Design a protein around this motif. Structure first.
Motif, PDB file in Angstrom:
ATOM      1  N   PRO A 291       0.845  -1.194   0.000  1.00  0.00           N
ATOM      2  CA  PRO A 291       0.000   0.000   0.000  1.00  0.00           C
ATOM      3  C   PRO A 291       0.875   1.237   0.000  1.00  0.00           C
ATOM      4  O   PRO A 291       0.488   2.306  -0.480  1.00  0.00           O
ATOM      5  N   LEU A 292       2.081   1.075   0.537  1.00  0.00           N
ATOM      6  CA  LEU A 292       3.044   2.149   0.709  1.00  0.00           C
ATOM      7  C   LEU A 292       4.287   1.820  -0.098  1.00  0.00           C
ATOM      8  O   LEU A 292       4.844   0.726   0.036  1.00  0.00           O
TER       9      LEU A 292
ATOM     10  N   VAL B 155       1.518   6.025   8.956  1.00  0.00           N
ATOM     11  CA  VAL B 155       0.161   6.097   8.439  1.00  0.00           C
ATOM     12  C   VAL B 155      -0.712   6.774   9.476  1.00  0.00           C
ATOM     13  O   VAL B 155      -0.654   6.428  10.663  1.00  0.00           O
TER      14      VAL B 155
ATOM     15  N   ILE C  99      -4.010   5.061   4.047  1.00  0.00           N
ATOM     16  CA  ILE C  99      -4.133   3.872   3.215  1.00  0.00           C
ATOM     17  C   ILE C  99      -5.498   3.219   3.352  1.00  0.00           C
ATOM     18  O   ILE C  99      -5.695   2.101   2.869  1.00  0.00           O
TER      19      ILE C  99
END
Lengths: 54, 46
Positions: A32-33, A46, B13
């Motif tokens: 995701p990162l 996050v 996210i």
């Protein structure tokens, strides 16, 4: 007695070492990162939004 | 040795605090309006 000189043959009949089937890597959350470079200590901290109570 | 100047990235996210699902309101008789009165019709015998 009769003594013969013969080679030592080697064949690959298809036997091998049985091994696990790969299943897990396709399930978990991957990447995701991405921009780990360009962040201090290789961390992309996050955020999680705030909730409140009435 | 080498020293670089990098920022602390902050990214979202989709991870969020888990919250309850609103179910009970809408299943309960709500009446928009100080106070209101409800009249029950009368019954009798014979």
């Amino acid at each position: 007695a009769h003594i013969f000189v013969k080679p030592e043959l080697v064949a690959e009949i298809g036997v091998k070492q049985l091994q696990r089937e790969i299943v897990l890597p396709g399930l978990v959350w991957t990447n995701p990162l991405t921009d780990f470079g360009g962040s201090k200590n290789d961390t992309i901290t996050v955020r999680v939004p705030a909730i409140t109570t009435a």
